[PDB]
Each structure stands twice: as C-alpha cells, then as structure tokens.
C-alpha cells in the first residue's frame, strides 16, 4: 500500500499536545526540532504545509510556575495567552535553521462561519503559502473557549483543511490509528468507522475534511520520521480517502453558497482568460455590475450573451465593484481610498460553468 | 508644587497605546521598544497595571519578507502582519524579560467584542492576566478583520481595550488628531481618562506617572463606577435572576467581594452566560446586578456548592465565581 | 395630578389578556379600537401591543386549558395571532384606520441592522397614519411566552415613545405617582416601566375596567399609577448614541448640512457629505464632523461607508442609478441623530 | 407520466405574486384555498408560502406605483400582510380549515435554536390539522424585498418541515430547453444553463437537499393542484437524488457534535430501534459533556455503542436536572418546560 501523502502537495499537519509537551515540564524542544526538520524536508520537496500545533497551555503553565493543569477556564485562557508566544518562538527558531519563515495565526470556528472573515483568513493563508511561509495555526482562546477543555485541535485541523483546500490532513497522535486489527485504509465518512471507535473526534475530523476533497491520515507521532516516510509513499497508521475530488467539491461548495441577488457581466477577453488561461477575474474585465453582493459571497460571472461562464467568491462589494470596474489594479487605491486584493475573484475561489 | 498634575499619577490601571511611527524605523526600532519596555516596567514596579496596545507588525513583516515598500494589496498586508506579529512580540518579551516581567500576546477584533460571551471571555482572560502580574500585549487580528490595517493605527482598539478592562486611563503616545479625540470619547464611556502625548518626549510615561502633565489630558465626565452602573442598567434582563442569602448580601455590600455559587439560595427564570442579572435578597429586594458566568440551568446544579465541587457536578468548570466583583454593581 | 398622557404625542398601548379575553371579547376590543381611534383623531401616534393571541388560538383549537408545553403554546400563538388581528383590523376599519401586523423578537432588536429596519418600518407606518399592532414572534423565540409587558417596553424604546400605557385588571401598584425605576417597587409591569424609562418613556399602569380610560388619560385625568422617567427623551437618545458609537469611521459634512442639522431640525442627506473616512456599516452609530474637524452630530447610518462614498454629493433621486438599488433617501434620519 | 405529487403526503405550495395579485385577486385566492382544502381532506399536509403582501399594502395605502424607497416597501408589506392573511383565513374557514400566520427570515433558520423552534411550531401545527401560511419578515430583513418572490423561502420551508414535495406555481409553463422539460433530476447542473426561472431551479436544488421533490407548473392551469394530486403530471417535475430518510441521516452527520452526548437505557434503546418512538428524559441514564438546544447529539447505549443521533430539545445542564423524570415533573424542576421529549422521533435517526 502506497501512502496518499506521496501524491499530496498541500498538507495540514496536526500535532497533538502529548507529542510536543513533556508532561508538567513545558515544551519538548527536541521533539519540536524533529517536526520542524521533517516539515522543512517536505517544504524542500515542494509541499505546502500548514501546521496546527498544541502546547500553548503547557508552555504557559511553565512560564507562570504552575505544576498542574488548571481546572478553571480563565486560568486556562491565561496560560494559553502566555504560552502561545513561547510555542511559536521555538518553531520559528528550529524552522529558521532550515531557512524557513513561519507565521502565527489565531482563528475561531466563529470567524470561519462569517463570509467576510472566512475569505480574509483564506486569503491570508493562501498568500502565505504562495510566499513559501509555513503558517502555524491555533484557536483564539481569549475569545472562544469551547475547545479548550477537552479538544486537542482535531476539529480545527479539518476546518483548516477545508479553508485552504488541502490535499491531505495528517493527524499525528499517541494512538497507532483506527482499530477494528489496525485499519490501514478506508473511505472517509463511512458510518462503520464511527462504530469502530479521542479516536472518534479524529474520525469525525476526517469526514469533515473529506467535504472539501481532503484525504486524512491518522498516525502515531511516536513513529520515527513519520512525515518523511508518508511523503516517500510508505503507509503508516490509517488512511481515509475522500469520495469526492478537490475540484468537484469546490463546484459543490460554490453551488451551495451561490446567491443570485447580484452578479457581474464580463467581456470576451475576461471569459477567455478564465476558461483557457486558468486566470483570475480582474476588475478591468468587468463590463457591468447588476444587483447587490458583499465581499465573501459567491456570485455568477455572466458573458455578454447572458450565459453563466463561472462562479466564485467576490473580494469586493457590488458598490465597490461599480467604482473600480474597467480600471487597472494600480488605480483601485486612488478610486476607493484603499485597496483589497488586485483580483475581483481569485482563480482559487472560482469554478467554471 | 502648583504645576498641573497628571491624572496618570492617580490611575492604577492603564492602557498604553504606542503609534507605528514610534516603534518602527520608517523594520522595528529595537532600542525604542526597549525604552518603552523599561518605562512600563518602572510603572509596573510602582504598582500600576498596564496593558500595551502596540503597532509595528507590518513593518516587521516587511523586513522579514525582504520588502522595501509597504504593499498596496490587502492580502500582502495581511501576510506581512502574520509574519511580523511573531517578531514584534519576541522583541517585547525579551526587553520585558530583562526587567523580570512576563508578557502575553492577545489578538482581538471589534467583532469579537460585539458578542456577549466573547466579550466576557476576553475580559476574563485580561483580568486574570493582570491579577497574575502579566503585561498583556494586544493587537488586532488582521488575518480575519482588515479595518485596522487599511485605515487605522489602533486608536479605536486602545479605546475598546480601555472599555474592556475598565481602565483608569488610556495613554495615546504619538508623533505630535480626530480619530484620537474620538477614541478619547469612546474611552470616557467607561469612565477612562485619556492622555494624548508625544512619544518623542523623554521618559514620557515615568514623568506622567510622577504627576507631570504632558500633552493633552481629557477627563471623562462620568466616573468608573457610575459608568459601570449605567452599563449594567443598559444590559439588564429580567427573564431570570438569583436569590442570595444574607451572608452573600453582606459580602457584596460590605466586603467588596464576588458572588459565589455557595451564596445562591435559588435560581428563578432563565439566563445565559454573559447576560446581566439581578441578585435578589430573601425579601425580594434587588441588592446587586452583574454579568453571570453561568447559565440558569448550570447555576441550578451548582447552587450551594463550594467552587471545588463544580467540576464534579457539571463535568467541567468555568470560573469559580457566579458573578465576579469586577462585573457587578450594588442596587 | 395631571396625567402625563395629555402631553404625550406617541403612545405604546398594551392591553392585558384578562381585558381582551373571556377566547376573545370582541365588544371589549371594539371599545379599545374606538378609544385608540379617538386618540389617532386628536393627533396621537399609537402603537398597540396586544395580548390575547394564545387565548384566541386555544379557542380556535378547542383547548379549554392553557397548554404547558411550549410547542403547543407556539401553535396556539400562531393560530390566535390571525384572529386577534382580524378583529382589530375590522374594528379599526369602521373608523377609517389602517392597521399593520408586526412580529418582533428581543433578538432582532439586538442586531444593529434589524433594529434599524424595524425602527424605520414603524416610524414610516406612524408617518402614514397606520396603527401598528405588534406581537412577539413566538415561532422563533420562546423566552417570553414561557403577557407582553417586556415587549411593550422594548417597543417604547424602539420608537422613542413618550409613554407606555399598560392596561390591566388591577388598579395599579395605591401609588398615584413615583419615579420609574425606583428599587422599592405586578412585578413584570414595574420592571417594564424601568426598561421603558431607559429611553425617556413614562409609564402608566391603569385598570382597563375604568370607563374610557385612554380618553380620560389623554384629557389629563390621572388614573392608576404614573411612573415618570428620570431622563428626558432627547437626553436618553444622547446616552443611546454614546452607548453605541463606533469611531472606526465617520463623515465630514459641509456648512449647509451643519446648519440644516443644528437649526433646521432636518436629516443628513448624502448631498451634504463632503467626505467618508474609515469604515462603517448600516445601523452603526457614526460621528458627523465639520470642516474644522469638530464633531457636530452623531447618528445611525442607513448606508455603509463604501455606499456612502458612491452617493456622496448626489441628490436622493440619483442614488438608485449609482448603486443599482436604494435604501432610504437620508444618510442619517433626523429621528436617529443627536447634536454634538 | 405520473405526478410524484400523488405519492407525496406533506406539501409546500408556493404561489407567485402574479397569480395572487391583479391589490389582491380574491377569487383566485378562493380557488387556491378550495384546491388546498380538497388536498387537506384527502389527507395531505399542506404549508402555504404566498406572495402578495406589498401589492395589498399598496392598495390599502392608496399607492398606484410600487415604491422605490425601502421603508415604504416595508410599510406596504406590514400593511398588506394583514389583508393577505385575512383573505386566506376567510376562504379556508369556508371549508372548515384553520390557518396560522408564520413569519420567518433565512437568518432565523441558520441559527440552531431558532431553526428548531420554528420546526417544532410547524410540525405541531400540521399534527393539529392547521394550514400554516408562511411569509418573510420584511420588517427586520429586507434582502429579498427588491427581487425575491419567495422561491428560496419555499425551499427552506420544505427543508424545515421535511416536505415530500415543493410545488412552485408560476406564470410560465415550467423549464424550457432554451421544448418544455417534463422530468429531470433536481440539482443537475444543466438545468441552470437551460434557464425568474433560475431562482426556481436553485430552489429545487435546495429543496432536494432534504429529499424533497419539486414541481414547477403554471398556476393558470385549471385545478392544477387537484390534477397533480390525482397523478397527472403538469409542468416540470424535478426528482431529488436522495430519499428523505437518507437526507436526514446525512443532515444529522453534517451537524453532529461530540462535545456531549447522552447514555440511554435498554428500554429507551428498544423504543427507539423497534417502536419508532421519541427519546424521553426518563430513558436517559447519564449526560456527558456539554450541548445546547438544537445541537445534534449521539445517544449511546450502556455498552458505549452509538445507537441513534438527533436534535436535542434541552441543554446538557437542563437534561442533567430532568434525567429519569417523567415529563409532567419537568416544569417543577426547571421552572418552565419546553417539549416533553428530549429528542423527538422526527428529529432523530438510527445508527
């Protein structure tokens, strides 16, 4: 059996607390260095990697002089805010040794339910990946505490995979994988995987991830060089395959969120760029703006004949689009007093027909 | 002797906001950050509670990404912010560490604070950090909200943080004004005074704290406690409340203390975490009012129990208090 | 004691279940309709918050006992709301008065956009001489069904009523007069009076069994208990604007607009906007700044900052062409702003 | 070709503005009311989504032209809503049928608690043999006022009540190749290309998410609803790819959280698995973790196996207070009660 990771370019890697912390003595800096070295080697093979890592609370505890994990939520939130700085600094240092830049990101599930904040976060992350930066993502425990108690960032991992359209979510944990005999391969989202089973949340995370076409691997982080070995095509732990491909999931997602209160009409030059050139839709290609829409909504792109040729997430409101239509991107700032992205609809946020 | 006294000398809890220009060289000015850190450290050691709202993340990001010109596109600005955030904080942590001070990084947006639960969660985080003697360092979360990067310099954030922690004073350190005056108005709504002063003034924070007035001082019309009473009245709901015993009433009225689950005799009606509820005596008289940490159903389960028993009863715990002292008013 | 109702132009009238029900007492509703019609003809603006929906629903569903389960209460409310309104519409129609049905929840009113949308609907209905009839939307929120006293007070806040009148079975609290919100004081009716006073609205609690009670109060005769708000309507409006003010964005307005606002008691129109700074959304409270940079007013914006950028300096009849749609003609309605 | 409506028990009937307005066409409303009454007497459960409020409002306010300003549109809607319902109530009353007015917004239905509250209201009304009449609440949300004709609302109501079919009655015959399409799969991409037809096709796709089929037919057709219910196909019929129960299982899996659950006894397990019944508080042995009204939770047996999952009526704290208690004791314990069930049979699936 070949690991699906060998054919996956964009990976979300989720590392459990137990793997990154030395129970009661803060962070295991050596283990983080090993993860950093592995991720660096993936990055040098051409993979795009986002890291979802726990350990903030344990580091916070150490820095505050607490020997025991606090039971009260406020002390947990405090420890998280104190520890987040340390956890990232360690990752930055170890990644710097390999010439890799990192970034800290804090998200909540709420943010991702809002159309504007979803797009803002997606755009941040895709831009960071384009620039070759490794984003490091955590929950914002100062404002949302739902996952602080019992969660270990499994749901966050799947949400991040959806958010960036990852090819695969890798959950590195203490357990070997799913047991019936260890299940080496199965279909993500299959009912019986739930019966067979914090394994359950990881299986549910795999189902959520498969909604966007992402596959999932659940493997022990105690396995030596586990990420390299998966990337080399060696199957380790349990591999769950999404039923739907990334582009088909994207088309369903666009249809699911499509609104028809407004749209844009685009010229032939823009139509050709979209259909043949694999390009973004720019303001200059917009001939008219009809109706109303807001940043982050899904709108139809209609040709002169009135046929829908594409649909995608708009970066700009209909009123903003009205102001900047037919203008080159370098003129947007003068017209609005600010600019957002140069594209009206980014290529990564649209589908044909 | 008679020269105008700075309100900062009598202000225990301060929000200090430092402009981009002060903290950046047109990357980061590490020496200038050290000076702010040294001044804040001296305030901490005089007994002040300080929260820092600092800009500079984009400039640091630019330097780390090899960009000489500030990007015009929002996504490149957001990327620079996420890169720069890591550096900005590490510098502050280092310079504060030289004075024995712990820091924490906090990211907030105005959207977060518009939700009752998230507002209480953020408030509770910050007040717990101040209790532990940590200096919180607060920035906007530019990954999800791009208003601050686009048009701002964290003036509106400073005033929101002052409201959030009930600061005695917001200090806006600048290069030299409308957004800052509007910030002072917003800060005064919770009873916070504002000082607008040039950060190019030598030892400006120490001199203010020593009682020397510098720049412009704006005094809130309403005091902190009176602003709190108006805020509670504004948000009060009467769908539910708690009845509390005489021991709890005395602790609240005389002792300046929190309302604990053990003092709750009964729970009437319905309420949710982050709502404002009345605390009623056996005679049916409202004696206090405040933000509840727990729902009415949760409160029913834990009433009359010591805080160490909450976890066993619920399967989890939130705060040990039902209503923290900082989140309640009398009558 | 003179009744404060005599100098109150905009009234929220709340009629209790016992008064309106035996199902429904159609004759008693006719009497309330006739009284409200007479107030409307003296020039009062009246919004009605009426109970009775559940009782009517019960009758129409053949239920003799008030149901304990919320689902059955929700059903009875939805069934009964149709009957309760149809009766009111008929009786008001006899006097030439149009009515409208409005369903609101406390949640709606916590959202900045829905608050403004509801307020704007109601103020427009009042301008057109319609009597709005308001009920809770029990289909979606059940916190209150589980007699509309809280709703009355929220409506008074929403439309800036001069007075809330709660008509009940009891004579009052007898206290003839007191300060609304005074700790020492039915309980839900007193708490409603306190909530109402937060927008400057006074409250009267009086027995609906008193003959011609609304007319007599409007003539200046005090009946039942009168609770006076500590703060006036304009001062409460200023507190409400300060409470909701954001400073992420604002508008700069010209001298002509400043004068219309300060002297003329008028709205801020797009044509008076010289510039749009920062960011804001419909339903947020923004500062209006003059050429010298001084804040001269603050109010609820009908339009986002991007929309305002598009329509600044344009007459209202041109907004639709520029945006592809229009909202209100005003950027900030006169009823939704304060000076300084 | 047989109409799917003949085998559909629970119907959402959506009637376009043009059909119901000239003000209001009272005679045309009487005809719809008579047809719906006949369906109701054959045992169908019918929810009506009708337009017309703004037109009625305009008439009552003396306006000959549709207003451009949103506030005047909102006012006309509020005025017109009263008339539109009173007409329907009168005509239905002539056939012995009770009606109810319901106002919903799409936002309401995105919130877990408001969704359940609305679902519960409607299912209770249908059980009681009432015909609900549903409209958008234009007082609070104006997104749909400009261009919408309640097509999206119809589909959301079908999802909400798990309708067997959505019937959209319109001025046009149905969907055209650019030939009338008699039959197709709901949600098929090419139906969108073939096309306010587009919003109706999108409505059919949305409706099919809960297993509801859609019929789009001309309301100018004589006795159109009776003829469909008799099995005569008229207009365009769009068939959902997924069945109602399978869509319900997917919906439950989509919304499942595992932050909390309940453990239930063998008696409750049997009632669920064999008896097709609800989960009552009395069958709950323990409450683990945290959950809120409207969330989807697992029901676990003593052996730790998930046997069902469904929408909870109560929070975990409230469930803790009322576990093992008969329904008549809930009110004393909580100070209020919601539904007697912890998870209604309509809101759960077997696992």
From Swiss-Prot, chain A:
Catalytic activity: L-glutamate + ATP = L-glutamyl 5-phosphate + ADP
Pfam families assigned to the protein according to its UniProt record, in alphabetical order: AA_kinase, PUA
One GO BP annotation of this record: L-proline biosynthetic process
Compartments in which it is found: Cytoplasm
List of residues binding ATP: 14, 173-174
All copies of domain PUA, residue ranges: 261-339
The protein's Enzyme Commission number: 2.7.2.11
Stated name of the protein: Glutamate 5-kinase
From Swiss-Prot, chain B:
Positions contributing to ATP binding: 17, 174-175
Keyword field: Amino-acid biosynthesis, ATP-binding, Cytoplasm, Kinase, Nucleotide-binding, Proline biosynthesis, Transferase
Residues binding substrate, per UniProt: 55, 142, 154
EC category: transferase
E.C. no: 2.7.2.11
Subcellular location: Cytoplasm
Listed pathway(s): Amino-acid biosynthesis; L-proline biosynthesis; L-glutamate 5-semialdehyde from L-glutamate: step 1/2
Any GO MF annotation of the entry: ATP binding
Family annotation (Pfam families): AA_kinase (PF00696), PUA (PF01472)
Record has RNA-binding as a keyword: no
Catalytic activity: L-glutamate + ATP = L-glutamyl 5-phosphate + ADP
Coarse class of the protein's main subcellular location: cytoplasm
Family, as annotated: Belongs to the glutamate 5-kinase family.
Protein name: Glutamate 5-kinase
Organism of this sequence: Burkholderia thailandensis (strain ATCC 700388 / DSM 13276 / CCUG 48851 / CIP 106301 / E264)
Curated annotation (Swiss-Prot), chain C:
Spans traversing the lipid bilayer: none
SUPFAM superfamilies: Carbamate kinase-like, PUA domain-like
GO biological process, one term: L-proline biosynthetic process
Binding site for ATP: 14, 168-169
Compartment(s): Cytoplasm
All residue ranges annotated as the PUA domain in the record: 248-326
EC number from the UniProt entry: 2.7.2.11
A single MF term (Gene Ontology): RNA binding
Reactions this protein catalyses: L-glutamate + ATP = L-glutamyl 5-phosphate + ADP
Binding-site positions, substrate: 51, 138, 148
Gene3D superfamilies given in the database record: Acetylglutamate kinase-like, PUA domain
SMART domains documented for this protein: PUA
Disulphide-bridged cysteine pairs: none
Keywords, comma-separated and alphabetical: Amino-acid biosynthesis, ATP-binding, Cytoplasm, Kinase, Nucleotide-binding, Proline biosynthesis, Transferase
Record pathway: Amino-acid biosynthesis; L-proline biosynthesis; L-glutamate 5-semialdehyde from L-glutamate: step 1/2
Any Pfam family hit: AA_kinase
Broad EC category: transferase
Any one GO cellular component localisation term in the record: cytosol
Top-level taxonomic group: Bacteria
Summary of the function given for this chain in its UniProt record: Catalyzes the transfer of a phosphate group to glutamate to form L-glutamate 5-phosphate.
Protein family (similarity comment): Belongs to the glutamate 5-kinase family.
Protein name as catalogued: Glutamate 5-kinase
């Amino acid at each position: 059996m070949r690991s699906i990771i060998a054919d996956s370019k964009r990976l979300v890697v989720k590392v459990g607390s137990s793997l990154v912390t030395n129970d009661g003595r803060g962070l295991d800096h050596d283990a983080i260095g090993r993860w950093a070295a592995q991720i660096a080697a993936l990055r040098n093979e051409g993979k795009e990697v986002v890291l979802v890592s726990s350990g903030a609370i344990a580091e916070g505890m150490q820095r505050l002089g607490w020997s025991r994990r606090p039971r009260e939520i406020d002390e947990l939130q405090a420890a998280a805010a104190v520890g987040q700085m340390g956890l990232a600094q360690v990752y930055e240092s170890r990644f710097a040794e390999h010439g890799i830049r990192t970034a800290q990101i804090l998200l909540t599930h709420a943010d991702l339910a809002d159309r504007e904040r979803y797009l803002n976060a997606r755009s941040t992350l895709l831009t960071l990946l384009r620039l070759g930066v490794v984003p490091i993502i955590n929950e914002n425990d100062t404002v949302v505490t739902d996952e602080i108690k019992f969660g270990d960032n499994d749901t966050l991992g799947a949400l991040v995979a959806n958010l960036i359209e990852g090819d695969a979510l890798i959950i590195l944990t203490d357990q070997q994988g799913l047991f019936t005999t260890l299940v080496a391969e199965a279909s993500a989202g299959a009912p019986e995987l739930e019966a067979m089973a914090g394994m359950l949340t990881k299986i549910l995370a795999a189902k959520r991830a498969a909604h966007s076409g992402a596959n999932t691997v659940i493997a022990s982080g105690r396995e030596r060089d586990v990420l390299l070995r998966l990337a080399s095509g060696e199957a380790i732990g349990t591999q769950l395959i999404a039923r739907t491909a990334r582009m088909a999931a994207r088309k369903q997602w666009m249809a699911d969120h499509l609104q028809v209160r407004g749209h844009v009409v685009i010229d032939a030059g823009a139509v050709d760029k979209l259909t043949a050139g694999g390009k973004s839709l720019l303001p200059i290609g917009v001939v008219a703006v009809q109706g109303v829409f807001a940043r982050g909504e899904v709108i139809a792109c209609v040709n002169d004949a009135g046929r829908e040729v594409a649909r995608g997430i708009t970066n700009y409101s209909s009123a903003e689009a009205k102001l900047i239509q037919r203008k080159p991107s370098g003129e947007i700032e003068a017209v609005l007093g600010y600019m957002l992205e140069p594209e009206l609809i980014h290529r990564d946020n649209l589908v044909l027909v």
